[PDB]
């Protein structure tokens, strides 16, 4: 696995890298839901439900990332 | 085994480029109405994560080789 060739150096840095990528992946998802509503491929109500559920998940990742960064001595 | 660091870096950049085009292709297929939503949300999310993992590892390996 090429993914395994360069990795963070300790479990907490791995957690931080996973939180960074998950939060970004959710923003990507929310952005294209907004683009799908403008194109009319989803309707308003299914749009607001998934954005709500995705934004709830992104808060938990963001709050966690704050705790992880402070526990590791990184800027916050 | 014994691949050069620049060879490993070419591999990883190529693996990042594949997932980016994969997820980009998924995205327009979904904006075209060609892909159902609850399919998209799970798989695109899961693939975007790996795309961001690879962007980071690419930047770290690039700075290792000292660009």
């Amino acid at each position: 696995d090429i993914d395994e060739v360069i990795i963070p150096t300790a479990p907490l840095y791995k957690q931080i890298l996973n939180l960074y990528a998950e939060e970004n992946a959710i923003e990507d998802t929310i952005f294209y839901l907004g683009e799908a509503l403008r194109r009319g491929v989803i309707d308003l109500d299914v749009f607001l439900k998934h954005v709500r559920l995705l934004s709830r998940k992104q808060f938990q990742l963001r709050a966690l990332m704050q705790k992880a960064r402070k526990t590791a001595g990184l800027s916050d | 085994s014994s691949a050069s660091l620049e060879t490993l870096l070419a591999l990883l950049q190529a693996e990042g480029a594949k997932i980016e085009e994969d997820t980009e292709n998924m995205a327009e297929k979904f904006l075209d109405g060609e892909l159902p939503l609850d399919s998209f949300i799970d798989v695109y999310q899961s693939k975007r994560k790996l795309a961001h993992m690879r962007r980071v590892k690419i930047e770290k390996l690039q700075e290792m080789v000292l660009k």
């Binding site: 395994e4 360069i6 963070p8 150096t9 931080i16 | 930047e59």
Partner: peptide, 19 residues
């Protein structure tokens, strides 16, 4: 930078190692 949405600069002090 601390916010993941402001780019990969958020990962600047995160150490990586080869294997």
């Amino acid at each position: 930078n601390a916010s993941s949405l402001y780019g990969i600069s958020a990962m600047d002090g995160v150490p990586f190692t080869l294997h």
